[PDB]
Amino acid sequence: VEKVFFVTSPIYYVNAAPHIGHVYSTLITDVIGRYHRVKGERVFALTGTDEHGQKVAEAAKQKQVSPYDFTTAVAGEFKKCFEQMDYSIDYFIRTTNEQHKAVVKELWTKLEQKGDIYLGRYEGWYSISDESFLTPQNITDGVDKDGNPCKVSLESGHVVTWVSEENYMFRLSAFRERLLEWYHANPGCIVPEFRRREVIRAVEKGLPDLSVSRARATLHNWAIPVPGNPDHCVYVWLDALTNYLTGSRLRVDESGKEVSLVDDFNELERFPADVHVIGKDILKFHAIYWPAFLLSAGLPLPKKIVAHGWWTKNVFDPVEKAEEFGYDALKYFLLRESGFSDDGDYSDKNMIARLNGELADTLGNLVMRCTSAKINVNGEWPSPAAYTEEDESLIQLIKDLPGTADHYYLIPDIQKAIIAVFDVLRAINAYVTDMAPWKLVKTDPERLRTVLYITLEGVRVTTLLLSPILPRKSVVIFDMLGVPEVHRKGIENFEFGAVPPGTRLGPAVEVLFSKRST
Numbered sequence: 001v002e003k004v005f006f007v008t009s010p011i012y013y014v015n016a017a018p019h020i021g022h023v024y025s026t027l028i029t030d031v032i033g034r035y036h037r038v039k040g041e042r043v044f045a046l047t048g049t050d051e052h053g054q055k056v057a058e059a060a061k062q063k064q065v066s067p068y069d070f071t072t073a074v075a076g077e078f079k080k081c082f083e084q085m086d087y088s089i090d091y092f093i094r095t096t097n098e099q100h101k102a103v104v105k106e107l108w109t110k111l112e113q114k115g116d117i118y119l120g121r122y123e124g125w126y127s128i129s130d131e132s133f134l135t136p137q138n139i140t141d142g143v144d145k146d147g148n149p150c151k152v153s154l155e156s157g158h159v160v161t162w163v164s165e166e167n168y169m170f171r172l173s174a175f176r177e178r179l180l181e182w183y184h185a186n187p188g189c190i191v192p193e194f195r196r197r198e199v200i201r202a203v204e205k206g207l208p209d210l211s212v213s214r215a216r217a218t219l220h221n222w223a224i225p226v227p228g229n230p231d232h233c234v235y236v237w238l239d240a241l242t243n244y245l246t247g248s249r250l251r252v253d254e255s256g257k258e259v260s261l262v263d264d265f266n267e268l269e270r271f272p273a274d275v276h277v278i279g280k281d282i283l284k285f286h287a288i289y290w291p292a293f294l295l296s297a298g299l300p301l302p303k304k305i306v307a308h309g310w311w312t313k314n315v316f317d318p319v320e321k322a323e324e325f326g327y328d329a330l331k332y333f334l335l336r337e338s339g340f341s342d343d344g345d346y347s348d349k350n351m352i353a354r355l356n357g358e359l360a361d362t363l364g365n366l367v368m369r370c371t372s373a374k375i376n377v378n379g380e381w382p383s384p385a386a387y388t389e390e391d392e393s394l395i396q397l398i399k400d401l402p403g404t405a406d407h408y409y410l411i412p413d414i415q416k417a418i419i420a421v422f423d424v425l426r427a428i429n430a431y432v433t434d435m436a437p438w439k440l441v442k443t444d445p446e447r448l449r450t451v452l453y454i455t456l457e458g459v460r461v462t463t464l465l466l467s468p469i470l471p472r473k474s475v476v477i478f479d480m481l482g483v484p485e486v487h488r489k490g491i492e493n494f495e496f497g498a499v500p501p502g503t504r505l506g507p508a509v510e511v512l513f514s515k516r517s518t
Protein backbone atom coordinates (compact mmCIF):
# COMPACT_ATOMS: atom_id res chain seq x y z
CA VAL A 1 0.00 0.00 0.00
CA GLU A 2 1.54 3.33 -1.15
CA LYS A 3 1.27 5.80 1.75
CA VAL A 4 3.43 8.60 3.25
CA PHE A 5 6.10 6.94 5.41
CA PHE A 6 5.29 8.22 8.91
CA VAL A 7 8.05 8.16 11.55
CA THR A 8 7.77 9.73 15.07
CA SER A 9 9.88 10.64 18.06
CA PRO A 10 8.36 10.81 21.51
CA ILE A 11 7.07 14.25 22.48
CA TYR A 12 9.25 15.38 25.39
CA TYR A 13 8.31 16.77 28.78
CA VAL A 14 9.25 20.43 29.15
CA ASN A 15 10.11 20.45 32.90
CA ALA A 16 13.80 20.35 31.98
CA ALA A 17 15.93 21.83 29.23
CA PRO A 18 16.84 19.61 26.26
CA HIS A 19 19.59 17.11 26.99
CA ILE A 20 21.20 14.15 25.17
CA GLY A 21 18.27 11.71 25.64
CA HIS A 22 15.94 13.84 23.50
CA VAL A 23 18.64 14.58 20.95
CA TYR A 24 19.25 10.81 20.65
CA SER A 25 15.57 9.86 20.32
CA THR A 26 15.04 12.56 17.69
CA LEU A 27 18.25 11.63 15.86
CA ILE A 28 16.92 8.05 15.42
CA THR A 29 13.62 9.44 14.13
CA ASP A 30 15.58 11.76 11.78
CA VAL A 31 17.82 9.01 10.35
CA ILE A 32 14.90 6.65 9.60
CA GLY A 33 13.08 9.54 7.93
CA ARG A 34 16.21 10.40 5.92
CA TYR A 35 16.81 6.81 4.74
CA HIS A 36 13.25 6.59 3.38
CA ARG A 37 13.76 9.94 1.67
CA VAL A 38 16.95 8.69 -0.05
CA LYS A 39 14.96 5.67 -1.02
CA GLY A 40 12.63 8.08 -2.90
CA GLU A 41 9.58 7.65 -0.63
CA ARG A 42 7.31 10.41 0.72
CA VAL A 43 8.17 11.01 4.36
CA PHE A 44 6.55 12.80 7.29
CA ALA A 45 8.79 12.83 10.37
CA LEU A 46 7.32 14.13 13.66
CA THR A 47 8.79 15.40 16.96
CA GLY A 48 7.58 17.70 19.74
CA THR A 49 6.85 18.64 23.31
CA ASP A 50 4.54 17.25 25.98
CA GLU A 51 3.43 20.39 27.77
CA HIS A 52 0.47 19.60 30.03
CA GLY A 53 0.50 17.75 33.35
CA GLN A 54 1.29 17.95 37.07
CA LYS A 55 5.03 17.56 36.54
CA VAL A 56 5.36 20.56 34.17
CA ALA A 57 3.02 22.78 36.18
CA GLU A 58 5.05 22.03 39.33
CA ALA A 59 8.31 22.76 37.44
CA ALA A 60 6.79 26.14 36.37
CA LYS A 61 5.83 26.78 40.03
CA GLN A 62 9.44 26.01 41.17
CA LYS A 63 10.80 28.47 38.59
CA GLN A 64 8.13 31.06 39.69
CA VAL A 65 6.44 31.83 36.38
CA SER A 66 3.11 30.85 34.68
CA PRO A 67 2.78 27.44 32.96
CA TYR A 68 1.98 29.12 29.58
CA ASP A 69 5.22 31.16 29.62
CA PHE A 70 7.30 28.30 30.95
CA THR A 71 6.13 25.84 28.28
CA THR A 72 6.55 28.39 25.46
CA ALA A 73 10.12 29.15 26.65
CA VAL A 74 11.24 25.54 27.02
CA ALA A 75 9.49 24.46 23.79
CA GLY A 76 11.56 27.23 22.20
CA GLU A 77 14.77 25.79 23.68
CA PHE A 78 13.85 22.37 22.22
CA LYS A 79 13.15 23.95 18.79
CA LYS A 80 16.51 25.70 18.84
CA CYS A 81 18.35 22.49 19.90
CA PHE A 82 16.93 20.51 16.96
CA GLU A 83 17.80 23.29 14.48
CA GLN A 84 21.27 23.45 15.96
CA MET A 85 21.54 19.65 15.59
CA ASP A 86 20.72 19.87 11.86
CA TYR A 87 17.80 17.45 11.74
CA SER A 88 15.28 17.27 8.92
CA ILE A 89 12.07 16.79 10.94
CA ASP A 90 8.98 17.76 8.99
CA TYR A 91 6.96 19.19 11.91
CA PHE A 92 7.31 20.12 15.65
CA ILE A 93 4.02 19.47 17.56
CA ARG A 94 3.12 21.03 20.94
CA THR A 95 0.29 19.63 23.07
CA THR A 96 -0.81 23.18 24.02
CA ASN A 97 -1.76 23.58 20.33
CA GLU A 98 -5.47 24.23 19.80
CA GLN A 99 -5.85 21.69 16.93
CA HIS A 100 -4.21 19.05 19.12
CA LYS A 101 -6.76 19.71 21.88
CA ALA A 102 -9.57 19.25 19.31
CA VAL A 103 -8.21 15.82 18.32
CA VAL A 104 -7.92 14.78 21.98
CA LYS A 105 -11.59 15.72 22.55
CA GLU A 106 -12.60 13.87 19.35
CA LEU A 107 -10.76 10.73 20.45
CA TRP A 108 -12.00 10.96 24.04
CA THR A 109 -15.60 11.28 22.82
CA LYS A 110 -15.17 8.32 20.46
CA LEU A 111 -13.92 6.13 23.34
CA GLU A 112 -16.83 7.28 25.58
CA GLN A 113 -19.46 6.67 22.85
CA LYS A 114 -18.01 3.22 22.21
CA GLY A 115 -18.66 2.27 25.94
CA ASP A 116 -14.95 2.11 26.80
CA ILE A 117 -14.76 5.03 29.28
CA TYR A 118 -16.69 4.85 32.71
CA LEU A 119 -16.72 6.85 35.97
CA GLY A 120 -14.74 5.03 38.68
CA ARG A 121 -11.87 5.46 41.20
CA TYR A 122 -8.15 5.00 41.01
CA GLU A 123 -6.65 4.15 44.44
CA GLY A 124 -2.92 3.44 44.23
CA TRP A 125 0.64 4.58 43.68
CA TYR A 126 1.62 7.20 41.09
CA SER A 127 4.96 8.63 39.89
CA ILE A 128 4.39 12.28 38.99
CA SER A 129 7.80 12.43 37.30
CA ASP A 130 6.87 9.43 35.05
CA GLU A 131 3.14 10.35 35.03
CA SER A 132 2.62 6.61 35.48
CA PHE A 133 0.24 4.43 37.55
CA LEU A 134 2.23 1.78 39.45
CA THR A 135 1.11 -1.35 41.32
CA PRO A 136 2.52 -2.19 44.82
CA GLN A 137 4.93 -4.69 43.13
CA ASN A 138 6.72 -1.70 41.37
CA ILE A 139 7.50 0.54 44.30
CA THR A 140 10.18 0.24 46.87
CA ASP A 141 11.88 2.11 49.68
CA GLY A 142 14.07 5.16 49.10
CA VAL A 143 14.60 8.88 49.82
CA ASP A 144 13.21 12.27 48.75
CA LYS A 145 15.76 15.10 48.30
CA ASP A 146 15.27 16.18 51.92
CA GLY A 147 16.68 12.67 52.65
CA ASN A 148 13.64 11.08 54.37
CA PRO A 149 12.10 7.58 54.23
CA CYS A 150 9.72 7.63 51.23
CA LYS A 151 8.58 5.24 48.52
CA VAL A 152 10.13 5.35 45.03
CA SER A 153 9.44 3.69 41.65
CA LEU A 154 11.20 0.42 40.71
CA GLU A 155 11.05 1.54 37.03
CA SER A 156 12.60 4.96 37.45
CA GLY A 157 13.71 5.60 41.06
CA HIS A 158 11.52 8.73 41.30
CA VAL A 159 9.39 9.53 44.31
CA VAL A 160 5.87 8.02 44.30
CA THR A 161 2.70 9.12 46.09
CA TRP A 162 -0.64 7.54 46.94
CA VAL A 163 -3.65 8.82 44.93
CA SER A 164 -7.30 8.35 45.85
CA GLU A 165 -9.46 10.04 43.24
CA GLU A 166 -12.77 9.61 41.46
CA ASN A 167 -11.56 9.27 37.84
CA TYR A 168 -12.77 8.40 34.36
CA MET A 169 -11.50 4.89 33.68
CA PHE A 170 -10.61 3.34 30.29
CA ARG A 171 -11.55 -0.37 30.07
CA LEU A 172 -8.05 -1.58 29.26
CA SER A 173 -8.74 -5.04 30.73
CA ALA A 174 -11.29 -5.63 27.89
CA PHE A 175 -8.43 -5.38 25.35
CA ARG A 176 -6.07 -8.11 26.70
CA GLU A 177 -6.99 -10.72 24.07
CA ARG A 178 -7.02 -8.32 21.07
CA LEU A 179 -3.57 -6.96 22.08
CA LEU A 180 -2.15 -10.47 22.45
CA GLU A 181 -3.64 -11.32 19.00
CA TRP A 182 -1.94 -8.22 17.61
CA TYR A 183 1.50 -9.13 19.08
CA HIS A 184 1.37 -12.72 17.75
CA ALA A 185 0.01 -11.84 14.30
CA ASN A 186 2.75 -9.16 13.97
CA PRO A 187 5.96 -10.54 15.41
CA GLY A 188 8.13 -7.62 14.22
CA CYS A 189 5.82 -4.90 15.60
CA ILE A 190 7.97 -4.32 18.71
CA VAL A 191 11.77 -4.06 18.45
CA PRO A 192 14.11 -5.26 19.81
CA GLU A 193 12.73 -8.76 20.32
CA PHE A 194 13.49 -9.03 24.09
CA ARG A 195 11.31 -5.93 24.65
CA ARG A 196 8.57 -7.47 22.55
CA ARG A 197 8.68 -10.53 24.82
CA GLU A 198 8.55 -8.23 27.92
CA VAL A 199 5.37 -6.55 26.69
CA ILE A 200 3.73 -9.93 25.90
CA ARG A 201 4.55 -11.34 29.36
CA ALA A 202 3.01 -8.26 31.02
CA VAL A 203 -0.21 -8.42 28.97
CA GLU A 204 -0.48 -12.22 29.45
CA LYS A 205 -0.39 -11.66 33.25
CA GLY A 206 -3.52 -9.44 33.03
CA LEU A 207 -4.40 -5.77 32.60
CA PRO A 208 -6.19 -3.47 35.02
CA ASP A 209 -8.42 -0.63 33.78
CA LEU A 210 -6.58 2.63 33.25
CA SER A 211 -7.35 5.96 34.83
CA VAL A 212 -7.69 8.47 32.00
CA SER A 213 -8.79 11.53 33.98
CA ARG A 214 -7.64 13.33 37.09
CA ALA A 215 -9.40 15.91 39.29
CA ARG A 216 -8.53 19.44 38.08
CA ALA A 217 -7.10 20.63 41.43
CA THR A 218 -4.45 17.87 41.34
CA LEU A 219 -3.14 19.07 37.92
CA HIS A 220 -3.00 22.77 38.91
CA ASN A 221 -5.53 23.26 36.07
CA TRP A 222 -2.80 22.64 33.47
CA ALA A 223 -4.37 20.09 31.17
CA ILE A 224 -7.13 19.51 28.64
CA PRO A 225 -10.63 19.40 30.19
CA VAL A 226 -12.69 16.24 29.77
CA PRO A 227 -15.52 16.86 27.24
CA GLY A 228 -18.79 17.48 29.09
CA ASN A 229 -17.10 17.58 32.52
CA PRO A 230 -14.83 20.56 33.36
CA ASP A 231 -14.07 19.27 36.91
CA HIS A 232 -11.87 16.57 35.36
CA CYS A 233 -8.78 16.86 33.16
CA VAL A 234 -7.54 14.38 30.52
CA TYR A 235 -4.56 12.15 31.63
CA VAL A 236 -1.42 13.72 30.27
CA TRP A 237 -0.56 10.37 28.57
CA LEU A 238 -3.81 10.08 26.52
CA ASP A 239 -3.26 13.75 25.66
CA ALA A 240 0.41 12.98 24.90
CA LEU A 241 -0.03 9.79 22.86
CA THR A 242 -2.69 11.52 20.75
CA ASN A 243 -0.03 13.85 19.26
CA TYR A 244 0.67 11.12 16.72
CA LEU A 245 -2.93 11.20 15.50
CA THR A 246 -2.95 15.02 15.52
CA GLY A 247 0.33 15.19 13.58
CA SER A 248 -1.00 12.85 10.94
CA ARG A 249 -3.89 15.33 10.33
CA LEU A 250 -2.00 18.68 10.17
CA ARG A 251 -1.21 20.41 6.87
CA VAL A 252 2.10 22.26 7.17
CA ASP A 253 3.40 25.24 5.07
CA GLU A 254 6.99 25.61 3.70
CA SER A 255 8.09 27.46 6.93
CA GLY A 256 6.95 24.55 9.20
CA LYS A 257 3.83 26.14 10.80
CA GLU A 258 0.55 24.18 11.13
CA VAL A 259 -2.12 25.73 8.84
CA SER A 260 -5.08 23.31 8.80
CA LEU A 261 -6.41 20.26 10.70
CA VAL A 262 -8.14 17.80 8.35
CA ASP A 263 -11.22 15.84 9.46
CA ASP A 264 -10.13 12.46 8.12
CA PHE A 265 -6.60 11.05 8.65
CA ASN A 266 -6.74 9.28 5.25
CA GLU A 267 -6.58 12.65 3.48
CA LEU A 268 -2.85 13.01 4.37
CA GLU A 269 -1.92 9.28 4.09
CA ARG A 270 0.28 9.31 7.27
CA PHE A 271 -1.71 7.48 9.96
CA PRO A 272 -0.88 5.02 11.36
CA ALA A 273 2.83 5.42 12.13
CA ASP A 274 5.17 3.10 10.30
CA VAL A 275 7.79 3.57 13.07
CA HIS A 276 7.40 4.91 16.59
CA VAL A 277 10.85 5.69 18.06
CA ILE A 278 10.81 5.65 21.89
CA GLY A 279 13.09 5.12 24.86
CA LYS A 280 12.64 1.93 26.95
CA ASP A 281 11.11 4.08 29.72
CA ILE A 282 7.77 4.57 27.83
CA LEU A 283 7.25 1.16 26.29
CA LYS A 284 4.05 0.21 28.12
CA PHE A 285 2.33 3.45 27.13
CA HIS A 286 3.14 2.87 23.40
CA ALA A 287 2.75 -0.94 23.23
CA ILE A 288 -0.24 -1.46 25.56
CA TYR A 289 -2.24 1.74 26.15
CA TRP A 290 -1.84 3.34 22.73
CA PRO A 291 -2.96 0.35 20.62
CA ALA A 292 -5.85 -0.26 23.07
CA PHE A 293 -7.15 3.29 22.51
CA LEU A 294 -6.81 2.80 18.76
CA LEU A 295 -8.63 -0.55 18.91
CA SER A 296 -11.49 1.10 20.88
CA ALA A 297 -11.72 4.00 18.43
CA GLY A 298 -11.65 1.68 15.37
CA LEU A 299 -8.36 3.31 14.24
CA PRO A 300 -5.44 1.49 12.53
CA LEU A 301 -2.50 0.35 14.66
CA PRO A 302 1.14 1.35 14.13
CA LYS A 303 3.42 -1.01 12.20
CA LYS A 304 6.52 -0.90 14.41
CA ILE A 305 7.51 0.46 17.83
CA VAL A 306 11.31 0.62 18.30
CA ALA A 307 12.49 1.05 21.91
CA HIS A 308 16.15 2.06 22.53
CA GLY A 309 18.33 1.65 25.54
CA TRP A 310 18.23 5.11 26.88
CA TRP A 311 16.11 6.64 29.51
CA THR A 312 15.04 9.56 27.37
CA LYS A 313 14.08 11.53 30.45
CA ASN A 314 28.62 14.53 34.77
CA VAL A 315 27.42 16.68 31.82
CA PHE A 316 27.23 15.60 28.16
CA ASP A 317 26.07 18.58 26.07
CA PRO A 318 25.60 17.34 22.46
CA VAL A 319 25.78 20.85 20.96
CA GLU A 320 29.15 21.32 22.73
CA LYS A 321 30.59 17.99 21.51
CA ALA A 322 29.32 18.61 17.97
CA GLU A 323 31.27 21.92 17.92
CA GLU A 324 34.46 20.12 19.08
CA PHE A 325 34.29 16.95 16.91
CA GLY A 326 31.79 17.72 14.09
CA TYR A 327 28.00 17.34 13.84
CA ASP A 328 27.93 14.31 11.51
CA ALA A 329 30.74 12.68 13.52
CA LEU A 330 28.81 12.90 16.78
CA LYS A 331 25.68 11.55 15.10
CA TYR A 332 27.80 8.72 13.70
CA PHE A 333 29.19 7.99 17.18
CA LEU A 334 25.82 7.85 18.96
CA LEU A 335 24.31 5.56 16.34
CA ARG A 336 27.42 3.40 16.00
CA GLU A 337 28.41 3.13 19.68
CA SER A 338 25.26 1.52 21.01
CA GLY A 339 22.47 -0.73 19.83
CA PHE A 340 19.66 -1.65 22.24
CA SER A 341 21.44 -1.06 25.60
CA ASP A 342 23.05 1.67 27.75
CA ASP A 343 26.25 -0.44 27.45
CA GLY A 344 28.93 1.19 25.29
CA ASP A 345 31.11 4.05 26.56
CA TYR A 346 30.37 7.70 25.70
CA SER A 347 33.85 8.94 26.49
CA ASP A 348 36.06 11.45 24.64
CA LYS A 349 38.58 8.60 24.38
CA ASN A 350 36.19 6.35 22.44
CA MET A 351 34.67 9.25 20.47
CA ILE A 352 38.18 10.09 19.19
CA ALA A 353 38.88 6.36 18.71
CA ARG A 354 35.92 6.07 16.28
CA LEU A 355 36.42 9.48 14.64
CA ASN A 356 40.06 8.52 13.89
CA GLY A 357 39.71 4.81 13.16
CA GLU A 358 36.44 4.68 11.22
CA LEU A 359 35.63 8.17 9.91
CA ALA A 360 39.18 9.33 9.11
CA ASP A 361 41.29 6.18 8.47
CA THR A 362 38.60 3.99 6.94
CA LEU A 363 36.22 6.42 5.15
CA GLY A 364 38.18 9.68 4.88
CA ASN A 365 41.47 8.12 3.76
CA LEU A 366 39.68 6.15 1.06
CA VAL A 367 37.96 9.24 -0.37
CA MET A 368 41.29 11.08 -0.65
CA ARG A 369 43.04 8.08 -2.32
CA CYS A 370 40.46 7.66 -5.10
CA THR A 371 40.27 11.46 -5.76
CA SER A 372 43.95 12.55 -5.35
CA ALA A 373 45.83 13.97 -8.35
CA LYS A 374 48.59 11.43 -7.58
CA ILE A 375 46.44 8.34 -8.31
CA ASN A 376 43.46 9.77 -10.25
CA VAL A 377 45.57 11.82 -12.69
CA ASN A 378 42.76 12.72 -15.12
CA GLY A 379 40.32 13.81 -12.36
CA GLU A 380 37.55 11.53 -13.61
CA TRP A 381 35.77 8.20 -13.33
CA PRO A 382 37.86 5.94 -15.57
CA SER A 383 36.42 3.26 -17.82
CA PRO A 384 37.30 -0.17 -16.36
CA ALA A 385 39.19 -2.95 -18.20
CA ALA A 386 38.62 -6.67 -17.58
CA TYR A 387 37.80 -7.71 -14.01
CA THR A 388 39.88 -10.27 -12.09
CA GLU A 389 38.28 -12.70 -9.61
CA GLU A 390 39.52 -10.40 -6.80
CA ASP A 391 37.78 -7.42 -8.46
CA GLU A 392 34.57 -9.47 -8.65
CA SER A 393 34.69 -10.44 -4.98
CA LEU A 394 34.75 -6.76 -4.02
CA ILE A 395 32.07 -5.88 -6.60
CA GLN A 396 29.79 -8.56 -5.15
CA LEU A 397 30.16 -7.04 -1.67
CA ILE A 398 29.22 -3.64 -3.09
CA LYS A 399 26.26 -5.11 -5.01
CA ASP A 400 24.98 -7.04 -1.99
CA LEU A 401 25.30 -4.09 0.41
CA PRO A 402 22.12 -2.12 -0.42
CA GLY A 403 19.84 -5.12 0.19
CA THR A 404 21.56 -5.87 3.49
CA ALA A 405 21.60 -2.24 4.63
CA ASP A 406 17.92 -1.93 3.59
CA HIS A 407 16.90 -4.82 5.81
CA TYR A 408 18.81 -3.36 8.79
CA TYR A 409 17.32 0.13 8.23
CA LEU A 410 13.82 -1.38 8.05
CA ILE A 411 14.08 -3.40 11.28
CA PRO A 412 15.02 -0.74 12.31
CA ASP A 413 18.59 -1.36 13.55
CA ILE A 414 20.79 1.57 12.55
CA GLN A 415 23.94 0.29 14.30
CA LYS A 416 23.88 -2.86 12.15
CA ALA A 417 23.27 -0.81 9.00
CA ILE A 418 26.41 1.22 9.77
CA ILE A 419 28.51 -1.85 10.58
CA ALA A 420 27.38 -3.43 7.30
CA VAL A 421 28.56 -0.41 5.30
CA PHE A 422 31.86 -0.13 7.12
CA ASP A 423 32.52 -3.87 6.58
CA VAL A 424 32.45 -3.03 2.86
CA LEU A 425 34.56 0.10 3.47
CA ARG A 426 37.19 -2.06 5.28
CA ALA A 427 37.15 -4.47 2.33
CA ILE A 428 37.61 -1.65 -0.21
CA ASN A 429 40.60 -0.36 1.75
CA ALA A 430 42.12 -3.85 1.86
CA TYR A 431 41.64 -4.11 -1.92
CA VAL A 432 43.33 -0.73 -2.51
CA THR A 433 46.26 -1.73 -0.28
CA ASP A 434 46.50 -5.06 -2.12
CA MET A 435 46.36 -3.44 -5.60
CA ALA A 436 48.56 -0.42 -4.71
CA PRO A 437 47.17 1.99 -7.39
CA TRP A 438 49.91 4.54 -6.54
CA LYS A 439 52.37 2.00 -8.06
CA LEU A 440 50.03 1.26 -11.00
CA VAL A 441 50.15 4.84 -12.40
CA LYS A 442 53.67 4.08 -13.73
CA THR A 443 53.52 0.24 -14.10
CA ASP A 444 50.06 -0.61 -15.48
CA PRO A 445 47.63 2.23 -16.50
CA GLU A 446 45.06 -0.24 -17.95
CA ARG A 447 44.86 -2.01 -14.58
CA LEU A 448 44.65 1.29 -12.64
CA ARG A 449 41.47 2.20 -14.56
CA THR A 450 39.79 -0.96 -13.25
CA VAL A 451 41.06 -0.55 -9.66
CA LEU A 452 40.18 3.11 -9.49
CA TYR A 453 36.72 2.65 -10.99
CA ILE A 454 35.85 -0.06 -8.47
CA THR A 455 37.13 2.07 -5.59
CA LEU A 456 35.14 5.12 -6.73
CA GLU A 457 31.96 3.08 -7.14
CA GLY A 458 32.45 1.42 -3.76
CA VAL A 459 32.90 4.82 -2.12
CA ARG A 460 29.77 6.19 -3.83
CA VAL A 461 27.50 3.28 -2.89
CA THR A 462 28.75 3.12 0.70
CA THR A 463 28.40 6.92 0.99
CA LEU A 464 24.86 6.85 -0.38
CA LEU A 465 23.81 4.26 2.20
CA LEU A 466 25.61 6.34 4.89
CA SER A 467 23.93 9.61 3.82
CA PRO A 468 21.19 9.35 6.50
CA ILE A 469 23.95 9.09 9.18
CA LEU A 470 26.33 11.69 7.64
CA PRO A 471 23.99 14.06 5.77
CA ARG A 472 26.49 16.92 5.36
CA LYS A 473 29.69 14.90 4.85
CA SER A 474 27.95 12.70 2.24
CA VAL A 475 27.31 15.87 0.20
CA VAL A 476 30.98 16.81 0.56
CA ILE A 477 31.98 13.28 -0.57
CA PHE A 478 29.61 13.30 -3.53
CA ASP A 479 30.92 16.77 -4.59
CA MET A 480 34.52 15.48 -4.52
CA LEU A 481 33.48 12.41 -6.52
CA GLY A 482 31.56 14.67 -8.92
CA VAL A 483 28.33 12.68 -8.58
CA PRO A 484 25.41 14.44 -10.29
CA GLU A 485 22.53 15.41 -7.90
CA VAL A 486 20.18 12.95 -9.60
CA HIS A 487 22.51 10.02 -8.63
CA ARG A 488 22.50 10.89 -4.93
CA LYS A 489 19.04 9.56 -4.49
CA GLY A 490 16.67 6.76 -5.32
CA ILE A 491 16.73 3.01 -5.35
CA GLU A 492 17.89 3.09 -8.88
CA ASN A 493 21.19 4.56 -7.64
CA PHE A 494 21.78 1.77 -5.13
CA GLU A 495 22.75 -0.34 -8.20
CA PHE A 496 26.39 -0.83 -9.18
CA GLY A 497 27.55 1.27 -12.16
CA ALA A 498 24.95 4.07 -11.92
CA VAL A 499 27.50 6.84 -12.41
CA PRO A 500 29.08 6.41 -15.86
CA PRO A 501 32.81 6.60 -16.77
CA GLY A 502 33.93 10.05 -17.94
CA THR A 503 32.16 11.82 -15.07
CA ARG A 504 34.52 14.56 -13.84
CA LEU A 505 35.51 14.97 -10.19
CA GLY A 506 34.71 18.16 -8.31
CA PRO A 507 37.38 20.81 -7.81
CA ALA A 508 40.00 20.23 -5.18
CA VAL A 509 40.48 22.49 -2.22
CA GLU A 510 40.88 20.32 2.75
CA VAL A 511 40.01 17.27 4.79
CA LEU A 512 36.75 15.44 5.49
CA PHE A 513 37.47 14.33 9.04
CA SER A 514 40.59 15.73 10.70
CA LYS A 515 42.28 13.30 13.11
CA ARG A 516 42.57 14.29 16.72
CA SER A 517 45.21 13.74 19.26
CA THR A 518 45.04 11.06 21.80
Ligand code: MET
Pocket (backbone or CB within 6 Å): 010, 011, 012, 013, 050, 240, 241, 242, 243, 282, 312, 313
Ligand atom coordinates in the same frame (compact mmCIF):
# COMPACT_ATOMS: atom_id res chain seq x y z
C1 MET B 1 3.51 10.36 23.69
S1 MET B 1 5.26 10.24 24.02
C2 MET B 1 5.36 11.02 25.64
C3 MET B 1 6.78 11.07 26.19
C4 MET B 1 6.90 11.73 27.56
N1 MET B 1 6.43 13.11 27.51
C5 MET B 1 8.34 11.66 28.05
O1 MET B 1 8.98 12.75 28.18
O2 MET B 1 8.82 10.51 28.30
